[PDB]
Amino acid sequence: VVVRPAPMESATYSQSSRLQAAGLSPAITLFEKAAQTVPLPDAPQPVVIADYGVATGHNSLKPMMAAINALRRRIREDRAIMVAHTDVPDNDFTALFRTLADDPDSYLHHDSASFASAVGRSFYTQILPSNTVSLGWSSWAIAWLSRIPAGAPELTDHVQVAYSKDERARAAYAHQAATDWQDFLAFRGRELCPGGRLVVLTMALDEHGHFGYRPMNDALVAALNDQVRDGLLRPEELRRMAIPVVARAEKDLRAPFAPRGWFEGLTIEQLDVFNAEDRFWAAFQSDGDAESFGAQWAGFARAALFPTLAAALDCGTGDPRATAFIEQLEASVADRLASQPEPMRIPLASLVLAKR
Amino acid sequence: SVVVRPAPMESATYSQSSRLQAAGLSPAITLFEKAAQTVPLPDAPQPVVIADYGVATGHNSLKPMMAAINALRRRIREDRAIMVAHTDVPDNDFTALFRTLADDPDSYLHHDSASFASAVGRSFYTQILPSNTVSLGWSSWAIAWLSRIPAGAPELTDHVQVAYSKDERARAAYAHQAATDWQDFLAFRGRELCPGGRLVVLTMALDEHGHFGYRPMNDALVAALNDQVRDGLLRPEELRRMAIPVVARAEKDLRAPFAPRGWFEGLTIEQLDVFNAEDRFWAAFQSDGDAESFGAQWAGFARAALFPTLAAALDCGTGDPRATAFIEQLEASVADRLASQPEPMRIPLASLVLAKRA
Ligand SMILES: Nc1ncnc2c1ncn2[C@@H]1O[C@H](CSCC[C@H](N)C(=O)O)[C@@H](O)[C@H]1O
Numbered sequence: 001v002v003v004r005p006a007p008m009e010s011a012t013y014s015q016s017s018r019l020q021a022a023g024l025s026p027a028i029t030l031f032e033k034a035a036q037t038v039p040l041p042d043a044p045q046p047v048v049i050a051d052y053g054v055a056t057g058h059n060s061l062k063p064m065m066a067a068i069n070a071l072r073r074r075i076r077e078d079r080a081i082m083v084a085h086t087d088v089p090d091n092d093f094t095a096l097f098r099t100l101a102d103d104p105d106s107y108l109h110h111d112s113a114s115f116a117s118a119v120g121r122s123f124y125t126q127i128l129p130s131n132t133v134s135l136g137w138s139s140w141a142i143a144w145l146s147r148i149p150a151g152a153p154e155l156t157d158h159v160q161v162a163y164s165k166d167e168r169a170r171a172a173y174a175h176q177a178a179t180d181w182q183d184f185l186a187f188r189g190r191e192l193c194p195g196g197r198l199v200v201l202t203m204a205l206d207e208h209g210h211f212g213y214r215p216m217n218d219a220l221v222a223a224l225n226d227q228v229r230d231g232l233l234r235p236e237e238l239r240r241m242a243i244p245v246v247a248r249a250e251k252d253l254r255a256p257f258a259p260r261g262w263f264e265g266l267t268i269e270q271l272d273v274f275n276a277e278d279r280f281w282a283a284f285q286s287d288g289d290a291e292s293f294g295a296q297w298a299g300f301a302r303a304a305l306f307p308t309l310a311a312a313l314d315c316g317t318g319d320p321r322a323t324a325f326i327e328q329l330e331a332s333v334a335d336r337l338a339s340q341p342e343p344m345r346i347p348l349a350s351l352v353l354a355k356r
Numbered sequence: 357s358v359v360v361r362p363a364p365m366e367s368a369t370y371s372q373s374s375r376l377q378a379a380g381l382s383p384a385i386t387l388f389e390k391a392a393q394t395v396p397l398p399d400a401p402q403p404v405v406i407a408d409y410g411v412a413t414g415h416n417s418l419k420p421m422m423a424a425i426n427a428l429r430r431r432i433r434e435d436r437a438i439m440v441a442h443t444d445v446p447d448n449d450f451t452a453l454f455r456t457l458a459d460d461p462d463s464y465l466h467h468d469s470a471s472f473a474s475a476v477g478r479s480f481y482t483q484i485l486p487s488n489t490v491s492l493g494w495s496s497w498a499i500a501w502l503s504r505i506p507a508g509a510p511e512l513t514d515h516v517q518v519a520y521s522k523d524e525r526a527r528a529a530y531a532h533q534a535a536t537d538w539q540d541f542l543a544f545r546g547r548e549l550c551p552g553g554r555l556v557v558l559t560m561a562l563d564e565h566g567h568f569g570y571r572p573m574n575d576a577l578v579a580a581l582n583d584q585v586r587d588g589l590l591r592p593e594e595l596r597r598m599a600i601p602v603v604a605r606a607e608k609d610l611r612a613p614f615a616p617r618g619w620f621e622g623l624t625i626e627q628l629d630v631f632n633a634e635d636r637f638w639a640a641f642q643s644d645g646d647a648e649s650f651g652a653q654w655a656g657f658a659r660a661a662l663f664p665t666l667a668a669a670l671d672c673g674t675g676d677p678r679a680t681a682f683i684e685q686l687e688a689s690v691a692d693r694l695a696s697q698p699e700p701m702r703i704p705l706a707s708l709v710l711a712k713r714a
């Protein structure tokens with residue numbers, strides 16, 4: 001009865017996550033810096049790196065490689081480095097291991113003493129042994145709520161609570177986000193080695209409290225309403241639809257720590273809130289290709305958001321009706337955004353956390 | 357890829373269809389538990405690592421893992437971390453594994469508060485864990501699977517088991533592949549185990565007289581596959597392509613890397629037993645006389661473990677409804693054939709304890 005979000009669309013995520021990759025780029029630098037200076041386990045104990053919310057692994061290759069290269073300048077070439085990639089049980093881990101084996105950029109192909117493992121258990125509980133993780137990485141994952149909050153009203157705007165006019169919905173989602181953030185920190189706080197570092201990149205509210213992706217939100221809500229208008233989607237199904245993704249303001253990220261600035265042995269060593277460059281807009285300004293613009297944005301939304309939407313359908317998620325819903329929705333959202341291209345705000349927060 | 361590999365178990369049914377495997381590995385659990393009493397454990401804050409090589413869905417791993425964990429808890433503090441690293445091929449259903457570990461009441465995660473689980477989706481014929489980190493290794497019903505159909509080996513005319521082939525060249529090719537696979541497995545486990553660590557292996561054996569066993573099963577499967585061709589459900593070309601690269605090993609084969617001085621890549625055979633598992637399906641049939649249940653149990657066993665590899669030979673996709681129909685009909689036919697004439701079968705197994713040099 002605890003309703004959870006759906007994992008990324010395995011078949012398209014690696015090809016539809018260029019936005020996420022561009023956005024996390026600044027956090028890689030922080031992660032690399034952390035790897036250069038973090039206290040290390042006593043030799044020859046393996047150095048453990050944890051990647052919280054891996055999906056298909058495609059976007060993990062760059063940050064993992066950056067950390068490993070930094071560590072190699074500090075340790076013997078034969079010393080083991082273990083990367084623990086974590087996600088939910090229903091993530092496609094076969095896709096992950098194929099990425100790790102097949103992608104030329106995989107750290108497995110660049111470092112003969114690196115190892116990979118997967119953990120398919122929610123990161124809102126402790127999932128790794130205490131005091132073992134030297135370096136933690138988590139990008140575009142903690143914005144996902146553990147659940148649609150208990151007793152929260154159905155979102156009439158469906159796709160994002162930030163754009164809802166229902167006061168009770170906003171508070172329910174915000175409380176769930178606060179609880180999840182506390183839980184995430186509590187358990188990473190146990191998993192990290194003393195002196196260990198954790199780098200988090202997540203969806204933020206900008207300085208003016210805004211979520212962003214406004215034209216995307218509009219195009220998605222309009223595309224969903226068109227399907228119920230066309231009789232393709234049932235009104236009962238649309239009412240059920242909700243994407244439990246939550247952005248956090250700077251005060252929300254500091255909440256567990258204030259006022260003394262420590263929470264469960266963890267402190268914020270660095271925090272940045274910024275707006276990621278809108279690369280799809282930059283490309284559109286350059287080549288004037290409106291269709292490509294629509295397809296870029298639609299693909300991003302499909303791989304990340306549509307499985308959660310498709311889970312509200314009466315039929316199973318493996319049903320041919322669900323595939324048709326996905327494809328039609330992607331095509332519609334593409335058309336709307338292509339017809340009037342605009343820049344979008346992509347607000348992010350990057351944090352470096354340290355353990356006592 | 358030109359290297360043709362076997363297929364993983366059918367995750368939809370393996371947990372319901374692996375009672376034969378579970379009953380067969382039972383004696384190896386005692387060996388594993390005993391090893392857990394004395395193996396060296398790594399320095400703080402490292403977790404004790406137990407490696408499970410060839411996990412499939414995890415269903416049959418729960419009892420061995422718990423035995424080891426219970427033994428370790430008689431030695432160390434309750435708050436010491438134990439990590440179980442479950443390994444399989446990349447195309448194993450690891451979602452099914454993590455669902456087993458979350459949902460099955462027998463899961464060690466539900467019985468031990470400081471135990472953890474991880475998955476490694478890389479062939480165990482390479483090194484897949486950090487050197488010297490594994491205190492206890494476990495592998496049941498996994499190393500009988502060849503790394504590949506041997507290069508240049510002739511097509512099997514009976515498809516489902518090389519031991520029943522009349523082709524000398526095919527038998528030699530599979531035997532050589534099995535021998536090199538075993539060397540590889542041992543070489544890389546020898547690196548992964550800590551000094552003084554122990555690895556318990558349970559695998560398909562040839563009995564005292566060189567026999568593979570499952571003879572009535574073999575006959576039913578071959579006959580059923582021929583029926584599908586005859587009935588226009590299977591192309592002759594598809595059947596020609598079918599081969600299950602499972603190999604049983606005699607005592608001499610298991611000892612081969614070690615002979616004559618007893619060591620190979622830092623490992624030695626501490627204990628080896630070869631035995632025939634009690635045929636529980638036969639025992640049940642003797643008790644209740646239910647021929648249909650007998651056929652269904654044997655057919656379900658074969659389906660979960662063997663049919664995915666057979667289905668891989670089809671001209672259609674493995675996601676195609678035709679592959680699903682093939683599997684279902686093959687199961688029904690084998691079930692009917694065995695139900696019609698229930699017979700006991702030999703299930704030859706070898707259980708080994710390997711020790712890494714102190
Ligand atoms: N409670 C939870 N535990 C573990 N993973 C979770 C989670 N909630 C969401 N996720 C995962 O977080 C991922 C978001 S996609 C982010 C993938 C990658 N880190 C990148 O930067 O592109 C998805 O795989 C989703 O399944």
Ligand SMILES: Nc1ncnc2c1ncn2[C@@H]1O[C@H](CSCC[C@H](N)C(=O)O)[C@@H](O)[C@H]1O
Nearest residue numbers: 364377410412416444445479480496498501
């Ligand atoms: N080279 C290889 N590397 C890793 N796993 C392998 C392998 N070859 C076969 N396997 C796995 O071995 C398993 C055989 S089924 C055995 C499952 C369980 N150990 C039990 O006793 O019941 C399958 O999951 C198969 O995918």
Ligand SMILES: CCCCCCC[C@H](O)CC(=O)O
Nearest residue numbers: 020140143160213216217304
């Ligand atoms: C208007 C809704 C748009 C929200 C966009 C959410 C983007 C996801 O966080 C990406 C991801 O999880 O990898």
Ligand SMILES: CCCCCCC[C@H](O)CC(=O)O
Nearest residue numbers: 377497500517570573574661
């Ligand atoms: C005659 C053919 C009988 C082969 C029986 C093979 C049994 C498999 O090893 C079981 C498994 O992998 O879990």
